[PDB]
Symmetry: C7
Subunit: 173 residues, 7 copies
């Protein structure tokens, strides 16, 4: 499947360039890999930026929160890039990049809404944490976040930049 480049597979040469890809649904296996790649890239140097490319519909909240906390834990600056879409938990990882270093390509779709075995109280505690993350990183008030997360829709990149999910939309070809 994966081509070889000169030998490496392409994803491991991207990792050698300090690029981490989060593609497709987030789960405890995807999180485990992303966590391991972030902890590794910190051990190789704690000063060079890391580049995280997001194309995901989101996924499990607990897996997404594990990736988030590690991005906040590691000392590296993190550039974060949206390609195609970043929805639900995927847009939290996008929002959680370093201020000034959060980017999107012009046609990406951003969704802050959190699409609909556990007690009701425990899902609500997770959501209350999400409101505080979005308020922290977007600098919106909690009242704005709660109503924004109620609308089941995708933002355009220009709407998401004025909302504060993005810093830059790179239209330059």
């Amino acid at each position: 499947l994966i081509p070889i480049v000169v030998a490496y597979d392409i994803y491991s040469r991207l990792l050698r360039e300090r690029i981490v890809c989060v593609m497709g649904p987030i789960d405890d296996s995807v999180a485990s890999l992303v966590i391991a790649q972030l902890l590794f890239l910190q051990s190789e140097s704690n000063k060079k930026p890391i580049h995280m490319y997001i194309n995901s519909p989101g996924g499990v909240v607990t897996a997404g929160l594990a990736i988030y906390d590690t991005m906040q834990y590691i000392l590296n600056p993190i550039c974060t890039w949206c390609v195609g879409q970043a929805a639900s938990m995927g847009s939290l990882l996008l929002a959680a990049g370093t201020p000034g270093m959060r980017h999107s390509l012009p046609n990406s779709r951003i969704m802050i809404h959190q699409p609909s075995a556990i007690q009701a109280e425990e899902i609500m505690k997770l959501k209350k944490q999400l409101y505080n993350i979005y308020a922290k990183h977007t600098k919106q008030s909690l009242q704005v976040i709660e109503s924004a997360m109620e609308r089941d829709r995708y933002m355009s990149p220009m709407e998401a930049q004025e909302f504060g999910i993005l810093d830059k939309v790179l239209v330059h070809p």
Copy 2:
């Protein structure tokens, strides 16, 4: 198994050494990540030499194709897009997104820009207005023509697609 040739490469990696990217079968998030990774790698090898992009796909996920498209536009290199077999829905967008003068088809290919067949209607319509806009910029056609052409569930020949502006050259010769 993929045959090894001649260092020893599988042919898909040898073709990548010739700066050829293969987009084969349906487009999904896995294909999109592979195509974007291949494209970003080829830019690092040089910013100037063209990239060759061989399209044989029935299309696929719209947001996956837009991720490939956005990467094609970000990269500075000329991209030569070759239609082989067919390019339907999102596949004909990728064909059309090659650099002007470098979009080619073999003569028995079928081109379809109609989008055949989990999301709210408002977001599919927003996605579809993007397709109308980006076809118009790449084909140099009016939105009314695009809207009309994307409504007919039909394929068009490469000679028709050249007149419509999806293609630049049809290689009827060897």
Copy 3:
């Protein structure tokens, strides 16, 4: 597993042999097209050998392979092994004039046995008639008539029809 000597198929590819075996689809077509384009770069003038044992498959996948055969400048030997049916017999007939061969016991079928609109299936079908007409030099009516009969023909009858040039009598 397949035996090592290279893998057995990579050893054959170094002899400029392309094995089309089994049903043809987009995954098979992409393999065959990749191999055909490579072998032209390795030398622009030495023949390529295509060995065909196929029941056919997707039409656009087969037409993708066929277009590559006509694009590259090399002669192509086509060898019918066991059977070449539907799109498999088009690839057999697409070999270079004088260089289309069959083993004595091969069965060839040009009929097309048995997501798309009816008008689009018929337009594809009319393309096949034009391909067979130019390569067999039969009239369009004979092609339409012979492709309607759900049958196989022997190599000696396929040679008389113009699908083949040589049958390799034992």
Copy 4:
């Protein structure tokens, strides 16, 4: 698809060179076997350098988790334990079984001591009583307090789990 790092290692073997053991996903006999083998290997390389265990798990088989726990207590090394994402049921026992002073959580980890639900009833209760004694040893709560806390089907926050005695530090950033 697991990236390779350049000798060439997969990402998990590269981390094992940092003395990092990833206990991720559910625990079963093959997970237990793999963790125990890694712990015994890492002890051979140094009996006094710390080991780092990263935990994100919903729990698993109890006897498989107790096998891992017993290995953590056998080896002489300090074990720093990290909760990322969640540590539930048996995953919280491996968290609590880290070295005193070296059990850490990130701020959004979910901690559940409760045990959600093939053998006779007497064997489940006998496993339970072992768990109560292990938690009492490490959290320094009394058995009845553990029994009352372990009956509520809920998750603690990291700060609440520190007050319960499952954790020593909650870290936003490295100090």
Copy 5:
């Protein structure tokens, strides 16, 4: 698992010019057998090739692909029946070189074809099998037609008397 001896055991046998035709025959098996036959001819057109047959038969047009390769190449082919060669497996056995077709004492031979395309097309293929067996067995088509409809296995001694085999190993 296949043992390693460096080669896996089947590639080590191929260096002895041994081709194992074992298990059911299909279009994928035919590809492997034909590629191995053409390779062994490239390494030498003179030295014999050894075919080891253990199969219940299979697809007719796949077995005919193997058969036509056996007759095309110039090498002598020793065919060995191991365990059984039924239906199309017994055609490859009979198509060995005259005097070089061998069997072990407990091999079971069956020329009958046990048990989509039109009826008329199966019958044309079937009539080809009669001609192939008649050529190699040195027997009347009427005898082949009668023998090929009996749903039975021959012993190696019966198969030698019929003309499918030349030699039976005695132990």
Copy 6:
């Protein structure tokens, strides 16, 4: 999934003369364990071998194949119960060398055989288990036959008192 460490983690352990019997026992497991046991005897007939048991048991005739190899080879075998040794897993524990059978504190031992061939053939095979346990535990057949009837696990400190193992490695 298995990390590498010139090995994978398990071939590195095998170089320390450690054999792992993990998960259920079947014909595949029996063949692998017997091969490893015969290999380690060739490397030396004098150094101990370490066998780590975490098993729910499995096919009885597969476990007896492992057992007979343990008794054939000349090496001392240390047997370690980690987590659980039930049914056939407890026979491999009992069949370690005397003075060299160990358990971790939280292990579960079960001698009972949790519930094809004819009924008479299972009882024939069952009667061999009574003889094997009686040899190694030094209990009488009546004590073995009575103990095997209770569908229960037991703690290391009771299997030590029963004679299934010799040492419990209390945590420091």
Copy 7:
């Protein structure tokens, strides 16, 4: 999964062939390849076959058996765990004096139960001839002993002539 040569390629270098699990045409193919290879390495050094098998396809087992009898090497056969049905024929087909079992092995010569009944019967009559030849029992004993659906101990299997040695170790 398989420890590291791999453990079986190392064992094959000691001239050990493992027959474990049920026998089918793919197992027969791999065992026959190993037997023919080991004869090429030398036609004089013994070969060791380890059997732990329920048996399986009869014609696959008969293909192995004829290969064991064709090659000139001595073959030492070891019953490990169980040898049932066709597994007991491979065991019995070891070299006289070199057919061994561990003490707790179970041996069964009964043949538990795509082709016609008359054809299965022709196969079973060959089985009677093989067992009578190798065990030196009469055909009437073999025919009766295959009818009883039972296992026997290695000591009882030695009295029947399927074994020569029991390794009290």
